[PDB]
């Protein structure tokens, strides 16, 4: 109600990510609170308080002398930190109200090797899917405007075993027309993309 936040925000894995909140009409007796919500799940508390700075295992919170703005600090942003972050203000007795809020996305840096591969179903076996992977994080995968074709949003995985991150989108369809050569051609894939053909 009394808070304003960016709807979404990118931040680099893994330096500190600083989520800003504006609250220019704050009292007095009102504390500032930050919650985080992952998937549809219950929002979990991160940190609060008055007018000041504060810290715990999960994060740090700096509030200006103004009182009129605050900053949440997540000290070493990993992929697990990407979620929605709500900044709320409350001073007692009344209800608590949530806004929007942010939509933090930790982005990893790559040393890239973009390719589009075909994967076959395990049963089956055709039924197949197209995998666009190993692209750098500046590359965006677009939504197919062919309705029968399905393209997913891009997704970052971490092979923690080998200290290796990678991005990937997935495409599939039932059409005859459809193939992997053309699955991700409606996006703007990079010039050096590897397209197998044995």
């Amino acid at each position: 109600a009394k808070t304003t936040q960016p709807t979404s925000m990118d931040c680099a894995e893994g330096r500190a990510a600083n989520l800003p909140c504006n609250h220019s009409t704050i009292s007095g007796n009102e504390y500032v609170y930050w919650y985080r919500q992952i998937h549809s799940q219950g929002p979990q508390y991160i940190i609060h308080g008055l007018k000041n700075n504060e810290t715990n295992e999960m994060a740090s919170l700096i509030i200006t002398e103004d009182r009129k703005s605050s900053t949440l600090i997540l000290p070493h942003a990993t992929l697990r930190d990407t979620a929605v972050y709500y900044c709320i203000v409350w001073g007692g007795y009344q209800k608590v109200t949530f806004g929007t809020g942010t939509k933090l996305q930790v982005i990893p840096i790559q040393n890239p090797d973009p390719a589009v591969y075909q994967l076959r179903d395990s049963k089956s076996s055709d039924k197949s899917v197209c995998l666009f992977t190993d692209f750098d994080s500046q590359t965006n995968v677009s939504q197919s405007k062919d309705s029968d074709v399905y393209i997913t949003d891009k997704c970052v995985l971490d092979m923690r075993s080998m200290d290796f991150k990678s991005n990937s989108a997935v495409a599939w369809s039932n059409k005859s027309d459809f193939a992997c050569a053309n699955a991700f051609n409606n996006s703007i894939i990079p010039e050096d993309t590897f397209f197998p053909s044995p």
Binding site: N29, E30, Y31, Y33, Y35, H39, S40, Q41, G42, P43, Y45, H48, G49, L50, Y86, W90, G91, G92, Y93, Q94, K95, V96, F98, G99, T100, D113, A115, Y117, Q118, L119, R120, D121, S122, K123, S124, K127, S128, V129, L131, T133, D134, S147, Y150, T152, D153, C155, V156, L157, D158, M159, R160, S161, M162, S166, S168, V170, W172, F194, P196, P198
Partner: protein, 244 residues
């Protein structure tokens, strides 16, 4: 966590009444109710101080009624349910009317209300085996899981390798996507990726399972059609490593 809610999910037809329960953390003075829809923040419904409701939002129709008869557990009753009630209903509790004490949230009760229950389908799940092209180019091997075409969309996807849920090497789409988007009753699809080393995949003694928990109808729901009653269940697809 440590507040609880019952049930975790509920699918009704239009006419029906529905009742949720929320159990606060022991001796927590305060109990809050919110509702939430996809991509939006929680919307305040009502809150309690001891037994004493307090405030109910001009949201809540008369069809909603929230009780808390012992300043302890709280029930929310929604009468004559409507499509527009479909939402995640969140419970929160707080120790005292005290800014120092934070709200603890429960895991929520995801309500879906329907024109009719013949629109509820479980997922089918297929696991897709890695390309040889990938294996020879990167010496890594990506499996893909596809969950289709289910409704509503409360599914939970998980990869199990050699009998343990894994999180390293895994990616799942934040949201599902609509199969015919296009429609009111659009059925959904979700994909996930598991990436391993080429050599790990090329060992036939390794076993890969894709598990999707679906939250559907109850055993006790009136069911009409030929196909299996789309109850709450887990659908799976398996794959072993290819010696190749």
């Amino acid at each position: 966590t440590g507040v609880s809610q019952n049930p975790r999910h509920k699918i009704t037809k239009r006419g029906q009444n529905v009742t949720f329960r929320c159990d606060p953390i022991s001796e927590h003075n305060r109990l809050y109710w919110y509702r939430q829809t996809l991509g939006q923040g929680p919307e305040f419904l009502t809150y309690f101080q001891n037994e004493a409701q307090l405030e109910k939002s001009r949201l809540l129709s008369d069809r909603f009624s929230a009780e808390r008869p012992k300043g302890s557990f709280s029930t929310l009753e929604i009468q004559r349910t409507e499509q527009g009630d479909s939402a995640m209903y969140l419970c929160a509790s707080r120790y005292r009317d005290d800014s120092y004490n934070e709200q603890f949230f429960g895991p929520g009760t995801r309500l879906t209300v329907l024109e009719d229950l013949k629109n509820v389908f479980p997922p089918e799940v297929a696991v897709f085996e890695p390309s040889e092209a990938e294996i020879s180019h990167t010496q890594k091997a990506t499996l893909v899981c596809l969950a289709t075409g289910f409704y509503p969309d409360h599914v939970e996807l998980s990869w199990w390798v050699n009998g343990k849920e894994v999180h390293s090497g895994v990616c799942t789409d934040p949201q599902p996507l609509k199969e015919q988007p296009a429609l009111n009753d659009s059925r959904y699809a979700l994909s996930s990726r598991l990436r391993v080393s080429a050599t790990f995949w090329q060992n036939p003694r390794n076993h890969f399972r894709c598990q999707v928990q679906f939250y559907g109808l109850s055993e006790n729901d009136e069911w009409t059609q030929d196909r299996a009653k789309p109850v709450t269940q887990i659908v799976s697809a398996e794959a072993w490593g290819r010696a190749d």
